[PDB]
Amino acid sequence: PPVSQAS
Amino acid sequence: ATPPVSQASSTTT
Amino acid sequence: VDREQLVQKARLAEQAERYDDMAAAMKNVTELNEPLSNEERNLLSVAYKNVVGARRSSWRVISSIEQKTSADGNEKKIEMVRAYREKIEKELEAVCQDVLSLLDNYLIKNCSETQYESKVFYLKMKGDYYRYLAEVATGEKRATVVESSEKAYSEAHEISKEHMQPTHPIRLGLALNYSVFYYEIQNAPEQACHLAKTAFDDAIAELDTLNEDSYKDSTLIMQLLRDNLTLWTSDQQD
Amino acid sequence: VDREQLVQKARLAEQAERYDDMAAAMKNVTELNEPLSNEERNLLSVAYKNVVGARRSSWRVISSIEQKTSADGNEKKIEMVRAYREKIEKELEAVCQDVLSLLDNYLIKNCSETQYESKVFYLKMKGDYYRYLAEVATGEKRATVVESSEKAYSEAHEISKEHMQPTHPIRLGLALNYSVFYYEIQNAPEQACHLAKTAFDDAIAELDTLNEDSYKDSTLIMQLLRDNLTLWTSDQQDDD
Ligand SMILES: *[C@@H]1O[C@H](CO)[C@@H](O)[C@H](O)[C@H]1NC(C)=O
Ligand SMILES: *[C@@H]1O[C@H](CO)[C@@H](O)[C@H](O)[C@H]1NC(C)=O
């Protein structure tokens, strides 16, 4: 899995 | 609150 | 029916790492059909991300264990592993549909053309959760969700380009996840690397247009854009 | 479903960090009324520890919030925080009640008089979960469970001291948790430190009796016993 973001 | 170390695993092999 | 009561619960549930109660609380707040603040937008996103995230982490583990023991050739064992995988798949699907419904019928819909910010954030989520569905979908079913995710990311990008600076955390967060969609789901590595770099560089160009608050929070996302460009390029040369 | 598929689900559930499903699988296995194997005993113990453990962690987070916010003086918040604490308590107490039943109705019962290793483990387990109840109880309720926790540990202590080598991991693991009961619940640091130090000293004394199949298991618990004695002796010097 490649890194990600939710905030 | 302050817990010490514990353990819970029967020997498998 | 007190709203701030429910929001306080979302916070309190977050501290106790009880994300089911957290997601439940924030779903209820959204159902009151009023707009979410920047904080409330966060509490919703965190809650469901953790709820679905755990399922995904589990799904990958089950998938892996299936890929290995399948060649071992033990019938009954494979049957129960595959069954257990299906169990977690359905839990995942159910949670995604729950968020997507909240998006399609409460959040994205009731966003005027002046709240471009929230428009993209929800639009991003819509892409993220349709993407989760694609990760486990097969056959023509997969095709449907892949398109649905693509249609959500694309629209999020259009609104972002036009109204938001490249240094904005939301736009960076979008470019990050959108790029991942191309590499993982579409298997279009060049279009993925292109999007990631374009978004990265565009932020360097206007790097002096930073605000003290988004000065740290935005750059954090930039390193992630680079970390992906690192791993992606290293696999193609093999 | 076959008994072997149940255990295979437990193994899988553990790897997927789904301890609710893991505990459910081992519950079924236990209810088939056959004795559990060593690996199976480990699966049962680890499943319910993680389940109950998540509540203990949350309960401590929430009970901590309850002490920091009680000073603010907003009664709307204090009520709902207390309410959430109660919710978690109910969950925790339910899980414990579930394990304790499995112990008394299936595991400890079907143990014959020469199965010291299994009986000490289950009893040590029985003491652990009555202690979890004690951590969230008060008044006469707390008094009742603490008494039950004592009875469980105490008996386990006698059987292990008589039939098991000091280096035996089950015996060591009992001394560890039993010593915690003293320090945390009974608030008896002298009884805690003594029980732990002795259990450790006795293992070093007969350290040559480690069997290769589980030397790594015994050594691990021994470190924990010392890590405890270090931590505990540093708390007494602050209070003084
Ligand atoms: C984190 O990365 C995974 C892997 O693609 C992705 O599915 C997920 O959406 C990312 N997190 C967020 C919040 O988008
Ligand atoms: C782990 O340690 C805690 C605190 O010292 C104790 O309450 C708990 O019983 C231990 N775990 C087990 C499985 O006994």
Side-chain angles (χ1 to χ4, degrees):
Chain A
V3 71
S4 45
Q5 219 272 6
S7 287
Chain B
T2 153
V5 221
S6 81
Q7 209 260 5
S9 298
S10 191
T11 102
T12 307
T13 300
Chain C
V1 269
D2 191 333
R3 183 210 186 80
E4 273 299 323
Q5 275 285 88
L6 296 177
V7 172
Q8 283 181 149
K9 186 119 170 194
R11 303 199 195 91
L12 189 57
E14 188 187 8
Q15 311 230 252
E17 302 184 54
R18 294 173 61 88
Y19 300 97
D20 287 339
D21 299 342
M22 191 185 182
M26 287 307 303
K27 167 166 181 180
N28 202 339
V29 172
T30 305
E31 282 176 347
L32 299 192
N33 203 31
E34 290 183 7
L36 281 45
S37 67
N38 295 22
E39 179 190 1
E40 294 170 347
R41 277 192 302 129
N42 197 73
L43 284 170
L44 184 81
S45 191
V46 171
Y48 273 105
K49 173 59 191 315
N50 277 277
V51 169
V52 74
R55 270 80 196 174
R56 290 182 55 227
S57 171
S58 295
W59 187 87
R60 280 193 276 254
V61 169
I62 305 302
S63 289
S64 177
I65 288 171
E66 194 220 324
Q67 296 310 286
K68 298 193 286 81
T69 65
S70 177
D72 176 85
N74 192 333
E75 303 166 14
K76 258 162 163 49
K77 177 158 164 59
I78 298 302
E79 216 326 274
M80 86 78 56
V81 176
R82 286 179 181 177
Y84 194 64
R85 203 187 82 268
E86 273 295 334
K87 181 191 180 68
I88 298 179
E89 280 183 9
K90 293 174 90 285
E91 285 187 1
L92 197 160
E93 292 173 8
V95 173
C96 286
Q97 168 266 301
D98 193 39
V99 183
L100 292 173
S101 287
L102 266 172
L103 289 170
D104 284 332
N105 305 291
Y106 274 103
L107 293 168
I108 298 175
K109 188 166 64 179
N110 305 330
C111 262
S112 52
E113 307 293 353
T114 69
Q115 300 171 311
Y116 52 95
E117 247 187 35
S118 300
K119 241 288 181 70
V120 180
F121 183 61
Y122 297 135
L123 275 164
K124 185 182 121 297
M125 290 177 61
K126 187 163 181 288
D128 296 329
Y129 284 93
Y130 270 115
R131 177 159 60 90
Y132 302 157
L133 292 168
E135 289 185 343
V136 302
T138 75
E140 195 197 318
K141 187 88 72 169
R142 189 182 182 283
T144 311
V145 288
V146 169
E147 296 173 20
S148 306
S149 182
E150 163 61 57
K151 181 166 184 174
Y153 282 134
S154 171
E155 181 175 350
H157 196 192
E158 289 180 353
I159 307 306
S160 191
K161 275 156 135 179
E162 178 175 310
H163 301 263
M164 311 186 69
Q165 63 275 55
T167 65
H168 205 288
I170 306 297
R171 176 167 172 187
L172 292 167
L174 172 56
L176 180 54
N177 297 14
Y178 193 2
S179 65
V180 176
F181 168 67
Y182 279 134
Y183 190 88
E184 296 238 275
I185 312 303
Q186 299 285 45
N187 281 334
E190 284 289 74
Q191 196 173 359
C193 282
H194 177 260
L195 172 54
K197 184 160 189 61
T198 297
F200 181 71
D201 292 334
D202 282 24
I204 312 301
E206 295 78 58
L207 188 58
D208 48 32
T209 66
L210 270 182
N211 179 262
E212 239 295 305
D213 301 276
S214 64
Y215 122 93
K216 160 178 286 183
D217 208 331
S218 64
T219 51
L220 208 168
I221 305 174
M222 297 193 67
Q223 277 298 315
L224 304 175
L225 260 166
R226 163 162 292 191
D227 291 332
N228 283 337
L229 275 166
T230 296
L231 306 194
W232 286 340
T233 53
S234 72
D235 292 342
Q236 305 304 307
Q237 300 169 2
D238 289 27
Chain D
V1 330
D2 284 336
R3 180 200 161 95
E4 189 58 27
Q5 262 62 76
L6 291 175
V7 184
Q8 279 175 343
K9 194 177 291 179
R11 297 186 187 107
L12 248 190
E14 180 180 11
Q15 285 162 319
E17 302 186 44
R18 292 173 65 85
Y19 302 100
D20 285 274
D21 294 338
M22 186 187 175
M26 292 311 310
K27 178 171 175 183
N28 278 124
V29 170
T30 302
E31 285 173 341
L32 296 173
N33 203 59
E34 311 185 30
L36 307 188
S37 67
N38 288 317
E39 187 204 9
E40 286 169 7
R41 265 181 294 273
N42 175 79
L43 287 169
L44 177 72
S45 180
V46 164
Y48 277 109
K49 159 59 192 185
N50 280 277
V51 173
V52 79
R55 272 62 174 194
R56 295 179 67 218
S57 175
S58 292
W59 184 93
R60 279 200 271 262
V61 161
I62 297 299
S63 195
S64 165
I65 296 276
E66 193 179 30
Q67 291 294 347
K68 251 293 270 178
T69 62
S70 174
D72 288 25
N74 187 11
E75 310 306 326
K76 182 102 297 183
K77 232 243 245 178
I78 293 174
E79 175 59 88
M80 181 235 60
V81 171
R82 124 191 184 123
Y84 198 52
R85 195 204 66 220
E86 291 174 332
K87 183 187 177 63
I88 297 169
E89 283 186 28
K90 274 182 177 177
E91 277 178 18
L92 184 145
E93 293 183 24
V95 175
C96 292
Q97 252 178 4
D98 191 22
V99 185
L100 296 167
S101 296
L102 288 178
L103 289 167
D104 287 319
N105 278 273
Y106 292 95
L107 298 173
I108 299 177
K109 177 171 288 298
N110 288 336
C111 274
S112 77
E113 303 297 339
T114 55
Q115 315 199 269
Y116 313 102
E117 299 178 74
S118 291
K119 201 170 180 179
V120 167
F121 186 68
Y122 296 138
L123 284 169
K124 170 245 178 171
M125 215 170 146
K126 181 167 169 184
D128 288 324
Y129 283 99
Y130 272 122
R131 175 159 63 86
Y132 293 151
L133 297 172
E135 288 189 352
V136 300
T138 69
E140 283 299 285
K141 193 187 181 173
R142 189 183 185 279
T144 307
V145 292
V146 164
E147 183 179 65
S148 291
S149 186
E150 162 63 22
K151 193 175 191 299
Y153 286 138
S154 177
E155 178 172 357
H157 194 212
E158 296 304 87
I159 305 304
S160 75
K161 203 195 316 189
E162 177 171 322
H163 299 92
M164 313 181 76
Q165 285 294 275
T167 69
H168 199 300
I170 300 297
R171 167 165 173 174
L172 287 170
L174 165 56
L176 176 55
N177 288 8
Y178 193 4
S179 64
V180 170
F181 170 66
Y182 284 118
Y183 191 87
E184 269 186 316
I185 303 300
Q186 305 287 53
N187 192 32
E190 67 291 334
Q191 248 173 321
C193 290
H194 173 272
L195 175 60
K197 191 226 196 312
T198 301
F200 178 88
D201 284 338
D202 295 347
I204 301 296
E206 312 185 26
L207 186 53
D208 57 279
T209 67
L210 293 173
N211 81 314
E212 193 231 297
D213 301 326
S214 70
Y215 82 86
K216 194 106 173 62
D217 289 270
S218 305
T219 48
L220 208 162
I221 301 173
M222 285 172 63
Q223 295 170 275
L224 302 174
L225 272 164
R226 170 158 277 189
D227 286 327
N228 269 5
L229 286 168
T230 303
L231 181 72
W232 289 342
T233 51
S234 74
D235 262 32
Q236 303 301 308
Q237 294 172 358
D238 295 335
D239 294 329
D240 292 332

